[PDB]
Amino acid sequence: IDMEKSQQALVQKRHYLFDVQRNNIAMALEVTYRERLHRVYREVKNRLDYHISV
Amino acid sequence: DPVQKLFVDKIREYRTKRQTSGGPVDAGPEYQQDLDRELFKLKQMYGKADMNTFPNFTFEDP
Numbered sequence: 001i002d003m004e005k006s007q008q009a010l011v012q013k014r015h016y017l018f019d020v021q022r023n024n025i026a027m028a029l030e031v032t033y034r035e036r037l038h039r040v041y042r043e044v045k046n047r048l049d050y051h052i053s054v
Numbered sequence: 055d056p057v058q059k060l061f062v063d064k065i066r067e068y069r070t071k072r073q074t075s076g077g078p079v080d081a082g083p084e085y086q087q088d089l090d091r092e093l094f095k096l097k098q099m100y101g102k103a104d105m106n107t108f109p110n111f112t113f114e115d116p
Contacts, residue, residue, distance in 0.1 A: 028116065029073065029115075029116075030115070032115070036113050037113070039111060040110075040111065043109070043111070044108075046100065047107075047108075047109070050096065050097070050100040050101075053085055053100075054093070054096065
């Protein structure tokens, strides 16, 4: 009986795995976002800088 | 201020430089080759992109 109760509570707490998966996906996309921003900004910076060099 | 001959001398010679600068004066081929090499190293450090092309990355996803 006690084992049944305990595994029932485990089943209750089950969701954590899926939630971690979603968290991963979400902020993976987010920091992809932010690095793309960095990429464009840095590229334009370099493009404009090789004219000050000249 | 003008009494010092050297100051006025440099002044007038630079004036002449300015007027003769209607185009840059006394390049000499050495000038061109030096330009070539230094621009070459500069672009090679930077890249092979155009002078003024506004590019894009054409992003993607995982």
